[PDB]
């Protein structure tokens, strides 16, 4: 994150044989684009939703500086 | 200009004169929202006193322990879990008993930090200048302790060494 090598958080995502709640077939990534659903739970990837909320957080924090307050801008 | 702590900024309107320890330190202008400085000073002084006691307890627990085994933990954060819940609930109940009357007191009084606590009468006979000097001493020591107790907690949570 500090080094800017943000791709490292997307390397080695959860495989297609991952059993939810267990380490079998898991990965190490935390923020990924995968799209679709988990092959086992038939639901969105947890790494997809974490990345989604991080992007939403950055966007809303940026957008929260729009209106004027005690600092002239 | 008017801040002594930040000699370049001008202090906010509510930071002036009285309420000892007033060094013009409010860059964010938090005092501009509070109706008065009574409640924030009460909170600051409560934090100062609790932090002084916390630092003293940190050091003493580092060096001195009660005869019992349950109080033999040297790490204060580990002692937070090793000590039986009975002792901690007794401490919490004592604090809450002290806190409810002062809860009635703080939100309305002119000097919410003045709890009338002076068993040794260290303030009887002292002049106004001496009393203000004592208040300044208390506030300084409390702010330094707050910084210190937070540093001790952080270094224990980050390295496991409770002291030095």
């Amino acid at each position: 994150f500090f080094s800017g090598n943000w791709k490292a958080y997307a390397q080695n995502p959860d495989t297609a044989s991952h059993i939810f709640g267990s380490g079998e077939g898991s990965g190490t990534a935390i923020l990924t684009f995968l799209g679709g659903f988990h092959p086992q739970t038939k639901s969105l990837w947890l790494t997809d939703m974490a990345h989604h909320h991080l992007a939403i957080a950055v966007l809303f924090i940026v957008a929260g500086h729009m209106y004027r307050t005690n600092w002239l801008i | 200009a008017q801040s002594k702590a930040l000699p370049f900024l001008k202090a906010p309107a509510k930071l002036d004169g009285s309420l000892a320890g007033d060094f013009g330190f409010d860059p964010m202008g938090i005092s501009d929202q509070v109706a008065n400085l009574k409640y924030v000073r009460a909170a600051e002084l409560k934090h100062c006193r609790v932090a002084m006691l916390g630092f003293l307890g940190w050091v003493v627990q580092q060096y001195v322990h009660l005869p019992g085994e349950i109080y033999a933990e040297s790490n204060p954060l580990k002692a937070l879990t090793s000590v039986p819940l009975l002792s901690q609930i007794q401490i919490f109940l004592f604090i809450g008993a002290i806190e409810l009357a002062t809860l009635d007191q703080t939100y309305t009084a002119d000097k919410p930090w003045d709890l009338g606590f002076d068993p040794l009468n260290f303030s009887k006979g002292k002049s106004e200048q001496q009393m203000k000097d004592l208040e300044v001493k208390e506030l300084k020591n409390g702010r330094v302790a707050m910084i210190a107790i937070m540093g001790l907690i952080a270094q224990t949570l980050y390295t496991g060494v409770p002291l030095f």
Binding site: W6, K7, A10, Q11, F33 | -
Partner: protein
């Protein structure tokens, strides 16, 4: 003040006290340059070369952000030009 307007163009005060003083001959070419740069950055990050995890290029991203911006710069350029600036 009084950002309300009814003439041909709004007063320069609507641009803020940073764009209110830029000559239109500066904003115009700057807006065109920003639009071209942003379009090229967008077409280089995507379209011409497909995006990949290993190829994000903050320059192209930051660049692409100049396309939305460009819109604002040339709007301000027109406002300045119509206000004799």
């Amino acid at each position: 003040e009084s950002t309300y307007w009814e003439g041909k163009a709004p007063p320069s005060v609507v641009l803020g006290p940073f764009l209110s003083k830029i000559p239109s001959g500066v904003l115009g070419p700057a807006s065109l340059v920003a639009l071209i740069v942003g379009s090229y950055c967008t077409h280089e990050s995507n379209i011409f070369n497909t995006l990949t995890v290993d190829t994000i290029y903050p320059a192209y991203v930051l660049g692409s952000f100049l396309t939305p911006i460009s819109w604002g710069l040339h709007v301000a350029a027109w406002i300045q030009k119509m206000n004799k600036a």
